[PDB]
Design a protein around this ligand. Structure first.
Ligand SMILES: [Mg+2]
Ligand SMILES: [Mg+2]
Length: 114
RNA sequence: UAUUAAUCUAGAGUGUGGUAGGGAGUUUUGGAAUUUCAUGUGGAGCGGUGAAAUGCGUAGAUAUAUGAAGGAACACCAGU
């Protein structure tokens, strides 16, 4: 019922999440590899990110929006498969801003696995 | 060479004149980010791994938007 809005696409190294939201807060719908039915290790594969983007794009397109600002997030591997999925869905991508949290040397990160 | 009586400025210092620094201590100040809490939207997983399982989640989590509190460390500049 709204023309413009925001779709946050977080890409963790282990999973991915695509949240379609109002231009300010108030998410309208959300989807993830887990809710699709994919389980375990497969949830971290670029193909799954594209699949998740496709379902949320179809759902949100029937709701009737055109202009999308795409706030890319995370540091996974399928960060662009979802991007191409939305473009092939045909929504009007207006911005490609990236907002992955970067620290300015605050908080000590965890130990190195070996 | 050592001792003593003295002279000199080139060794080393002092002053004047230029001058580069994340040199140190004390007292204040700032923004991201994490965590917790508060308020909305939302509706089934999130999390983790070589693969999983403990764990967290319909008491509404992850996510998204705003605010508050608090502690720690000071991205880029930053380097033949
Ligand atoms: Mg680790
Ligand atoms: Mg805040």
């Amino acid at each position: 019922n709204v023309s413009s809005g925001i779709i946050h696409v977080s890409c963790s190294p282990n999973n991915t999440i695509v949240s379609a939201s109002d231009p300010g807060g108030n998410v309208l719908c959300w989807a993830s590899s887990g809710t699709m039915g994919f389980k375990g290790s497969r949830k971290k594969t670029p193909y799954s990110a594209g699949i998740a983007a496709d379902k949320v794009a179809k759902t949100v397109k029937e709701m009737g929006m055109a202009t999308v600002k795409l706030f890319v997030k995370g540091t996974g591997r399928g960060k662009d498969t979802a991007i191409r999925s939305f473009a092939n869905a045909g929504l009007s991508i207006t911005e490609i801003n990236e907002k992955t949290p970067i620290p300015h040397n605050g908080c000590k990160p965890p130990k190195r696995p070996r």
